[PDB]
């Protein structure tokens, strides 16, 4: 058996929106200590990796490990079916015929029960996070989202450049160009808004804006976004959940296509 | 002559939205005691039947009966032309060249007058309400609307099932399934929200979701919705107006297409 | 050099929306005393003419005259890139390679700099305002906008008719007709809302609704709209800026196409 009760369905809804772009079908490995899920896009340049621990649920129980393969368009369709604030419960049995999603509101009446037919997916799981990235920064998710959205209208390629205490986002395109330059600082009235940066090596990488636009919709899960960039590996964009994370690994455009 | 002054145009606007889906042209029989109107969809599985009495107007006068045949797309276009709160007045003469819609706001200046060319429709009027239905229920229009909207994304056929004190809405589809189960109760703090049910015979009927989605947009006219279901007749969905009603008769899917 | 600092980017954004409809590329002549710009639509029936004086800026400096030819779709794309309240600064040099747009918010950090490649446009500048128009009226921009939007759904041609103290807007079309009749008055509690009219000659002109819909989006720049109409010239619709204007000259439909 498996019973995972979210305190508010909105968290699961936004987690799956993190995947609803950018990728199609997903395996959800539920183990005794929580849920992991991974998904690669078709061009195989962006991996989405979710980890929800037990404390991020209001209740959680998994007797044996169980893998739930799900169509994200169909699961999203099912996930529009409550309020954001209803307690959504995932329920499955030993070898799962299908997953069962059980909503419940503050008015304990009229409980709604959906069921998603589970598909079969072959689980090629990737561990591609490095130990050392060339630079690490963190900034408010809102601010990263606006930078990406704005620059995405000038060209289809956004270029992130890190020098000593200087983070430069640039898009040069046919019509024109744009450049947002941010610098590290500590806001004392609100550590909400600070911009942290550790630079071990300057970086100059360029990413497709399609994918950065995909990545920034995790802003609805975390106040802040962590960006680990490296010339030797895909870049990592991390949104921290209440004891968990949603991660986007994105490969930069190559040298000759910059 | 005919002068029918709505206190607020929004009521007429929402009544015609009740028809703007699901059907195209409509006859409006205006008699000394108010307005009736009827309209069948093309597949001839859903009838929309409106009755507005005199008291639902702020003023009403009809010397002789008169039938106003109207294109609902065109009348809707005309009906976007004020505020929701302006006093809309229908005006016609003995044998009507066309209908005249006269708006007026709280600032008695700049009055706006539209005219809709009347068409010719042959009035095949249907009296298909039964005396006894197998079961009758009533529930808040908001709640019925959310049930229908949610379940409509899983399959194109919603199945209503009434057993002793148990009302079950179910959609099973290709991707998955959903089931909302409600039970009768009396809310004392708010009779707004109660769920009434009289069951003389259990029912198990299945309706096309296209049409239930059409039906639920009468939620903007009434706090509550009344559903009379029967295996021997089309189901009746009723929204009560201030001394009147908007009714949807919907034929269930047949036995072999369930 | 040229440095023109708007106190709020929203003004420039709305000015360019005034052009984003109805016309494609535009020359902006910046001289020592401010900015002028002109643009004709393809059918050559509507001219848009902007004049921003120095006081409409929070800061302004232009050493020598300079013409900035801009793609309005591309400049609009760039103009979605801040907040409405950031101080947008236009910057160019003696002979301009391209225009530079520099945003700045209340939080003086992270300043964003865009650049629009300038095109080459041949400046056929028109001075088509008359001395005497047949009639002049002024009314709230909101009210003119609603009249146009409403009447635009009945036909594609709106007909403005001015008699002694009577301003009549009419659209007769295939489906039906509509007519808004306004009359001059002075509101004392709010000169905001008054309707002024000087009639030297009655007018009966008819305008394509495509273009009136284009014209009314200047409502976001001025509380009021001034309409000079004449049978001997294109009609002039004027929105007054804080020491400036946005003007729409629109040729009426001819006599035989009324």
- The technique by which this structure was obtained is X-ray
Positions of E strands within A41-155? 46-53, 59-62, 66-71, 89-92, 98-103, 112-117, 135-140
- Structural domain harbouring B183: 1-258
- Closest CB to C111 among A154, A181, A185: A181
Residues B253, C215: Cα–Cα separation, whole Å: 52
- Choose from B106, B110, B115 for mutation: most chain C CBs within 10 A: B110
Q: Determine contact, residues A235/A188, Cβ cutoff 8 Å.
A: no
Residues A119, C23: Cα–Cα separation, whole Å: 52
> What is the least distance, in Å, from the CA of B152 to any CA of chain A?
10
Residues B82, B7: Cα–Cα separation, whole Å: 13
Question: Which residues of chain B have a CB within 8 Å of the CB of A114?
Answer: 154, 176-179
- From the number of C-beta atoms within 10 Å of its C-beta (0-12, 13-18, 19+), residue C125 rates as exposed
Give the per-residue SS3 of B31-76.
ECCEEEEEEECCCCCEEEEEEEEHHHCCEEEECCCEEEEEEHHHHH
Q: Determine contact, residues C70/C28, Cβ cutoff 8 Å.
A: yes
Question: Which residues of chain C have a CB within 8 Å of the CB of B110?
Answer: 143, 180-183
Chain B with chain C: Cβ pairs closer than 8 A = 47
Residues A168, A195: Cα–Cα separation, whole Å: 13
Instruction: Give Dmax over CA atoms of chain B in angstroms.
Output: 61
Residues B70, B6: Cα–Cα separation, whole Å: 18
Residue C145, CA atoms < 13 Å, CB-side half-sphere: 15
Q: Determine contact, residues A94/A42, Cβ cutoff 8 Å.
A: no
Enumerate residues 6+ apart whose C-beta is below 8 A from B244.
B34, B50, B51, B52, B53, B56
Q: Determine contact, residues A19/A83, Cβ cutoff 8 Å.
A: no
Are A178 and C113 an interchain contact pair (Cβ–Cβ within 8 Å)?
A: yes
Residues A68, A28: Cα–Cα separation, whole Å: 5
When computed from its CA atoms, the radius of gyration of chain C, rounded to whole angstroms, is: 20
- Closest CB to C175 among B110, B112, B116: B116
CATH number for the domain including B96?
A: 3.70.10.10
What φ, ψ does residue B77 adopt, rounded to 5°?
-50, -50
Residues A141, C198: Cα–Cα separation, whole Å: 57
Chain A with chain B: Cβ pairs closer than 8 A = 47
Q: Determine contact, residues C230/C237, Cβ cutoff 8 Å.
A: no
Nearest CA in chain B to C153: B77
- From the number of C-beta atoms within 10 Å of its C-beta (0-12, 13-18, 19+), residue B57 rates as buried
Residue-level length of chain B: 258
Expressed in Å, this structure's resolution amounts to 2.8
Q: What separation in angstroms does the CA of B77 have from each of B13, B70, B114, C178?
A: 10, 12, 11, 11
Helix (H, G, I), strand (E, B) or coil at A70: strand
Enumerate residues 6+ apart whose C-beta is below 8 A from A40.
A23, A46, A47, A48, A126
The partner residues of B68 in beta bridges, in order of sequence, read: B28
Terminal alpha carbon distance of chain A = 50
Residues B61, B64: Cα–Cα separation, whole Å: 9
Q: What separation in angstroms does the CA of B250 have from each of A104, A200, C210?
A: 31, 70, 42
Question: Which residues of chain C have a CB within 8 Å of the CB of A178?
Answer: 78, 81, 112-115
- Closest CB to C112 among A153, A176, A178: A178
When computed from its CA atoms, the radius of gyration of chain B, rounded to whole angstroms, is: 20
Residue-level length of chain C: 258
Residues B107, B112: Cα–Cα separation, whole Å: 12
Enumerate residues 6+ apart whose C-beta is below 8 A from A131.
none
- Closest CB to B74 among C175, C179, C185: C175
Q: Determine contact, residues C211/C249, Cβ cutoff 8 Å.
A: no
Transcribe chain C into DSSP letters.
-EEEE-S-HHHHHHHHHHHHTT--EEEEEEETTEEEEEEE-TTS-EEEEEEEEGGGSSEEEESS-EEEEEEHHHHHHHHTSS-TTS--EEEE-SS-SEEEEEE--SS--S-EEEEEE-------------S--SEEEEEEHHHHHHHHHHHTTT-SEEEEEEETTEEEEEEE-SSEEEEEEE--B--SS-GGG-BEEEESS-EEEEEEHHHHHHHGGGGGT-SEEEEEE-TTS-EEEEEEETTEEEEEEEPPP-STT-
- Choose from C146, C173, C178 for mutation: most chain B CBs within 10 A: C178
Residue C141: closest CA among C242, C220, C247, C245:
C220
Neighbours of B111 (CB within 10 A): 15
Are A153 and C81 an interchain contact pair (Cβ–Cβ within 8 Å)?
A: yes
Nearest CA in chain B to C176: B116
Q: Is the dihedral of CA B169, B146, B9, B72 positive or negative?
A: negative
Residues C22, C217: Cα–Cα separation, whole Å: 11
Question: Which residues of chain A have a CB within 8 Å of the CB of B143?
Answer: 110
The partner residues of A101 in beta bridges, in order of sequence, read: A90, A114
Neighbours of C24 (CB within 10 A): 13
Question: Which residues of chain A have a CB within 8 Å of the CB of C77?
Answer: 153-154, 175
Ramachandran category for residue A243: left, alpha or beta (phi over 0 → left; psi -120 to 50 → alpha): left
Residues C72, C244: Cα–Cα separation, whole Å: 20
Enumerate residues 6+ apart whose C-beta is below 8 A from B29.
B35, B36, B37, B65, B66, B67, B123
Residues A63, B46: Cα–Cα separation, whole Å: 50
- Closest CB to B175 among A77, A81, A82: A77
Nearest CA in chain C to A149: C81
| Residue A87 CA, distance from chain mean position | 22
Q: How many domains does one find in chain A?
A: 1
Are C117 and A179 an interchain contact pair (Cβ–Cβ within 8 Å)?
A: no
């Amino acid at each position: 058996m498996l019973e995972a009760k979210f305190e508010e369905a909105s968290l699961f809804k936004r987690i799956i929106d993190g995947f609803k772009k950018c990728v199609q079908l997903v395996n959800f490995q539920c183990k005794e200590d929580g849920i992991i899920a991974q998904a690669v896009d078709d061009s195989r340049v962006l991996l989405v990796s979710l980890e929800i621990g037990v404390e991020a649920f209001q209740e959680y129980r998994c007797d044996h490990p169980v893998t739930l393969g799900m169509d994200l368009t169909s699961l999203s369709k099912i996930l529009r079916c409550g309020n954001n604030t209803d307690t959504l419960t995932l329920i499955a049995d030993n070898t799962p015929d299908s997953i069962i999603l059980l909503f419940e509101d503050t008015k304990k009446d009229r409980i709604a029960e959906y069921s998603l037919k589970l598909m079969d997916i072959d689980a090629d799981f990737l561990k591609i996070e490095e130990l050392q990235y060339d630079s690490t920064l963190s900034l408010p998710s809102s601010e990263f989202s606006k930078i990406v959205r704005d620059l995405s209208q000038l060209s289809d390629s956004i270029n992130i450049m890190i020098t000593k205490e200087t983070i430069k986002f640039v898009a040069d395109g046919d019509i024109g160009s744009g450049s947002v330059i941010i610098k590290p600082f500590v806001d004392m009235e609100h550590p909400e808004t600070s911009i942290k940066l550790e630079m071990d090596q300057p970086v100059d990488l360029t990413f497709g804006a399609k994918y950065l636009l995909d990545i920034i919709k995790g802003s609805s899960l975390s106040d802040r976004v962590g960006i680990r960039l490296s010339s030797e590996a895909p870049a990592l964009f991390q949104f921290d959940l209440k004891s968990g994370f949603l991660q986007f690994f994105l490969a930069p455009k190559f040298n000759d296509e910059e």
